[PDB]
Amino acid sequence: PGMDSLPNPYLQSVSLTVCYMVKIKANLLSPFGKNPELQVDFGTGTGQGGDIPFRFWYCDGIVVMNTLKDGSWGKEQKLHTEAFVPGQPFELQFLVLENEYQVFVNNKPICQFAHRLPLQSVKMLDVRGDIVLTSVDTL
Amino acid sequence: SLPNPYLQSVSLTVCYMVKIKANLLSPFGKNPELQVDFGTGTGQGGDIPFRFWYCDGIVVMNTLKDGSWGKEQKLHTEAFVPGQPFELQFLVLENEYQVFVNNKPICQFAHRLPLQSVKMLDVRGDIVLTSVDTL
């Protein structure tokens, strides 16, 4: 039952471009008394409560995506998906393009998020949740 | 630097990226050439779903199927500055390859043969090839 994994939360300084990929490989846990959550922040890396151009949040069949701008969360983009089967390992991909982030799970497109803050203002990638995180790669 | 030509077995997906970093040379007696094959890896004459070729301000893209090339997609670009390092990206999506040079969109190539049939990446030309990465 031993397996190598990365720290959780996982932090990585980044500079996004118009053709940029994040690939996360992880598996949802079975936490005591709650459904496991997954959360990925493309954040500005300022202080606490600093801007978050793009947060991706998943729990129990539901994806919520939003933007934190000057202490204010915006209008949620919310959807249902069956892509995350606990406790099957999954591959979660974010593709940063000029117009939007594109999200894939296990090579299938799940959803897209139009940029609300400039992608150039993202400085910090933050991956956390009730997960065993095995790898995070960027290109 | 890396061998030139460069070969790497690959398996593409609907969200797949190739990033090439190279210095374009200044050969006396010709204009420098750059060629990237997304090929089937099935012998010397096998199908090539996507060839990207660049020389002297012109990009040509095409597909080799059953021993003959298709109808070209040709266009002009100034993105390759002679003698300068460049970064060339290929993004493989469900519908097309998207090409970027130094973080700028250059051109797109709709799939003509299945991306799943590409098995071999081939990078060559009048270049110093410093890195090839995929994800």
From TrEMBL, chain A:
UniProt-listed Pfam families: Gal-bind_lectin (PF00337)
Residues the entry annotates as binding beta-D-galactose: R55, N66, E76
Gene3D superfamilies given in the database record: 2.60.120.200
PANTHER family in the cross-refs: GALECTIN, PLACENTAL PROTEIN 13-LIKE
Lineage of producing organism: Eukaryota, Metazoa, Chordata, Craniata, Vertebrata
Top-level taxon of the source organism: Eukaryota
SMART domains: Gal-bind_lectin, GLECT
A GO molecular-function descriptor: carbohydrate binding
Protein name per the record: Galectin
Stretches assigned to the Galectin domain: 3-139
Alphabetical keyword list: Lectin
TrEMBL record, chain B:
Domain Galectin positions: 1-135
PROSITE patterns: GALECTIN
Source organism (scientific name): Ovis aries
Protein name per Swiss-Prot or TrEMBL: Galectin
Amino-acid positions noted as binding beta-D-galactose in the UniProt annotation, renumbered to this chain: R51, N62, E72
SMART domains noted in UniProt: Gal-bind_lectin, GLECT
UniProt cross-references to InterPro entries, sorted A to Z: ConA-like_dom_sf (IPR013320), Galectin-like (IPR044156), Galectin_CRD (IPR001079)
Keywords: Lectin
Molecular function in Gene Ontology: carbohydrate binding
